């Protein structure tokens, strides 16, 4: 059995609701998997669920405040581009 | 300082690249935050980053295989709708 869901929560799914989901899955003996962001995890393992990461197409906002803020932003920009992650 | 990035990696950003990012941030004394999915975390804390969760608009695919698979899918469907998470 396989079913596709669209996430509708403004908050998305964080640790608290992901914990409730994970514990619903754990009530059952079948193998339950959740597939997202190119990864398939065990729905009974919250460490699995919390390891899906940030998806392609995400907009993220980084802020740096402090004495080496310019050096910080430049390093972080360079890492995101070097590693082919974000731009 | 604030900058917005779009994530371009097919894989998105998982634990391995998020670990490299997190360690780039840690090299610096400024306060570095990452804002995503309605949450602002410390970019120096990988537990923070791995706690951003699944975003609004995500398509997730759940599979259940086993002796109580029908009971499993129905429980999981009911939880996702009850909690106003996914449909």
UniProtKB/Swiss-Prot annotation, chains A, B:
InterPro entries given in the database record: HPr, HPr-like, HPr-like_sf, PTS_HPr_His_P_site, PTS_HPr_Ser_P_site
GO cellular component terms given for this protein: cytoplasm
Gene3D superfamilies, A to Z: HPr-like
Modification Phosphoserine, positions: 11, 45
A Gene Ontology biological process term: phosphoenolpyruvate-dependent sugar phosphotransferase system
Record keywords, A-Z: Cytoplasm, Phosphoprotein, Phosphotransferase system, Sugar transport, Transcription, Transcription regulation, Transport
Activity control summary: Phosphorylation on Ser-45 inhibits the phosphoryl transfer from enzyme I to HPr.
List of catalytic residues: 14
Phosphoprotein among keywords: yes
The keyword Transcription appears for this protein: yes
Domain HPr: 1-87
Subcellular locations according to the entry: Cytoplasm
Family label: Belongs to the HPr family.
Function text: General (non sugar-specific) component of the phosphoenolpyruvate-dependent sugar phosphotransferase system (sugar PTS). This major carbohydrate active-transport system catalyzes the phosphorylation of incoming sugar substrates concomitantly with their translocation across the cell membrane. The phosphoryl group from phosphoenolpyruvate (PEP) is transferred to the phosphoryl carrier protein HPr by enzyme I. Phospho-HPr then transfers it to the PTS EIIA domain.
PANTHER family reported in the protein's UniProt record: PHOSPHOCARRIER PROTEIN HPR, PHOSPHOCARRIER PROTEIN NPR
Name by which UniProt lists this protein: Phosphocarrier protein HPr
Gene: ptsH
């Amino acid at each position: 059995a396989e079913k596709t869901f669209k996430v509708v929560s403004d908050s998305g799914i964080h640790a608290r609701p992901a914990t409730i989901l994970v514990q619903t899955a754990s009530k059952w003996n079948s193998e339950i998997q959740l597939e997202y962001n190119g990864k398939t995890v065990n729905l009974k393992s919250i460490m699995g669920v919390m390891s899906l990461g940030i998806p392609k197409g995400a907009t993220i906002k980084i802020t740096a405040e402090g004495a080496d803020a310019a050096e910080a932003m430049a390093a972080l920009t360079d890492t995101l581009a070097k590693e082919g992650l974000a731009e």
